[PDB]
Design a binder for this molecule. Structure first.
Ligand code: HEM
Ligand code: HEM
Ligand code: HEM
Ligand code: HEM
Lengths: 141, 145, 141, 145
């Protein structure tokens, strides 16, 4: 459960990142497919090759939901309820795969935004990405 | 069980690592990002804030030893279970660390590596270091009984 | 997320276990320490040798908590409040470990009560143990 | 990987398994307990209820091929990677199964073994079968890419 300090860290970091989120989603997805090949099992209908425009497109969708998550950190079960059904009942992604993407998102933000990636902000984004990952792993039964 | 191309990415990037800084950085971030881990380091002093942990002399000095053991991992990448046998036993029998956290410290090291090298930390270079850190976490987890 | 059939399945099993709840908990725990030795890192204050009385006393406490959970399947968040606090704030037990115990709880149940361990009850019990794991871990940070 | 104590426990109980019944039961129970796995098996017909899954000819026959592959693995226990190498490629390339699910199915099989064998399936007999199902799942995961 996200504190007052966490929310200001996240929103302040998400602002600096700004319009770049979508490209960071892309690279975070690429890094997930690269570093953890088992995640690609969920995307057999994707052209997954390096620099592919379906991964770019998809990472922008992932980014979109996260920006929407940044605005709704007081009630995340409500604002991700469409994604929540998609991930826990529709497709059903094993929770470990979320740890993979979450980590790779931190990797991407550290590579792109070093001045922002402080110890305290690193901490708040972890908390925020797994609070998103928990909502997403919901409706299994 | 690493390839030559992977060892190339790994050993190549590592020869440029700042053991003085990166060790202190990974351990500090572990205690900051994952506060439960602090319970294993009560002897180290003030860990009451990110500032406190990141300025802690004990965290920094122990963080150096951890990065030195990661250097040891690299030199012995073909025999991780062997190299990490004594340290596996220490963590199990003396420190009582759930081996789950090893993965956490491996991923923090990766982030600290990304933060230092920015865009030089390729997806390929990352993937290879992901392989190292999982290997090391696995070797330190082996002597648990 | 517990259905009506899950609830009557759960209370059915729990009635058949009856006064042996503690012993069932103690066994699930030994199966856990035995098949999943990493769980022992949480109990270095324990005698964990075969037939341990300390393990057996803890089996009853574990049974007592599940007994309370069975009574309050409509709102596990409220009923397991202090236990969530303990496992998250005081003890910080990694989520994977709940999965190892839950699995050995099913194995113990299957071992003891074959006539009750039907596919649907196997399903209802899995849902319950996992409902309980999620509550107990909810305050992960 | 396995000691001769571990193998004797495992092979001894395996010798008593009903080969026609057990695999089907392990598979039907995967589908019932973990209903998202049904989407992998849609050419199998009516999976709309527990009773309908548990009496499905195709789940029963598929469970039997799954069981025989565990038997082949017991037959090749010192080299599970090689025993499962062709199956690993299949599950990855053709089936797009997350190997995280391989552990789900092994644990259902351990639950069915517990069901069939009761008191005879003691914590020590389980542990050995846990070593088997973890090795099986690693070897099925191994040719992934
Ligand atoms: C923070 C974590 C995640 C977020 C915020 C997220 C968000 C999304 C979004 C926004 C969509 C598009 C749905 C739509 O608008 O039509 C989607 C679809 C999808 N997601 Fe995720 N996701 C996350 C993690 C994951 C993980 C870990 C996996 C498994 C590797 C996964 C697998 C999929 C798949 C297979 C689709 C279908 C999209 C398509 O086929 O085009 N997601 N997700
Ligand atoms: C996963 C990679 C890890 C490596 C390579 C590693 C390495 C080491 C080494 C080399 C030492 C001995 C330092 C010395 O005393 O001279 C040590 C000690 C120690 N480690 Fe780890 N470690 C790892 C993970 C962890 C984690 C995740 C934790 C806790 C959550 C932990 C807790 C401890 C503790 C409590 C000590 C004793 C510290 C003291 O009292 O001085 N280790 N480790
Ligand atoms: C079904 C899920 C679980 C339930 C219902 C449960 C219940 C309980 C109960 C009733 C207590 C005693 C609290 C008290 O006496 O006030 C306790 C404490 C404790 N739990 Fe759990 N627990 C569960 C899972 C776990 C797991 C998976 C682990 C770690 C492997 C764990 C580790 C501990 C430890 C180390 C204690 C303190 C024991 C001691 O210090 O004597 N618990 N739990
Ligand atoms: C966990 C250990 C597993 C073992 C030992 C195993 C074994 C097998 C075997 C022997 C086959 C038959 C291939 C052949 O005979 O040529 C097969 C096919 C198949 N497997 Fe698995 N499997 C496992 C896990 C899984 C899981 C968890 C899933 C899905 C969630 C899965 C999905 C499938 C599917 C969809 C087929 C093809 C069925 C058909 O249309 O004939 N497998 N597996």
């Amino acid at each position: 459960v996200l504190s007052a300090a966490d929310k200001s860290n996240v929103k302040a970091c998400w602002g600096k990142i700004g319009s770049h989120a979508g490209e960071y989603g892309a690279e975070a997805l690429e890094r997930t497919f690269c570093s953890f090949p088992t995640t690609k099992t969920y995307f057999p209908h994707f052209d997954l090759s390096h620099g592919s425009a379906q991964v770019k497109a998809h990472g922008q969708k992932v980014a979109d939901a996260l920006t929407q998550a940044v605005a709704h950190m007081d009630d995340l079960p409500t604002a991700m309820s469409a994604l929540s059904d998609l991930h826990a009942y529709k497709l059903r992604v094993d929770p470990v795969n979320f740890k993979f993407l979450s980590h790779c998102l931190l990797v991407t933000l550290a590579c792109h935004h070093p001045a922002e990636f402080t110890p305290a902000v690193h901490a708040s984004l972890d908390k925020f990405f797994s609070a998103v990952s928990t909502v997403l792993t919901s409706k299994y039964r | 069980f690493l390839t030559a191309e992977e060892k190339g990415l790994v050993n190549g990037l590592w020869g440029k690592v700042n053991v003085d800084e990166v060790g202190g950085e990974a351990l500090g971030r572990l205690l900051v990002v994952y506060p439960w881990t602090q319970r294993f380091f009560e002897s180290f002093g003030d860990l009451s804030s990110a500032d406190a942990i990141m300025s802690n002399a004990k965290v920094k000095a122990h963080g150096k030893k951890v990065l030195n053991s990661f250097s040891d991992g690299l030199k012995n990448i073909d025999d991780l279970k062997g190299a990490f046998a004594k340290l596996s036993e220490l963590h199990c029998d003396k420190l009582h660390v759930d081996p789950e956290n090893f993965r956490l410290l491996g991923n923090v090291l990766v982030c600290v590596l990304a933060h230092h090298f920015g865009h030089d930390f390729n997806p390929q270079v990352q993937a290879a270091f992901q392989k190292v850190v999982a290997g090391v976490a696995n070797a330190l987890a082996h002597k648990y009984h």
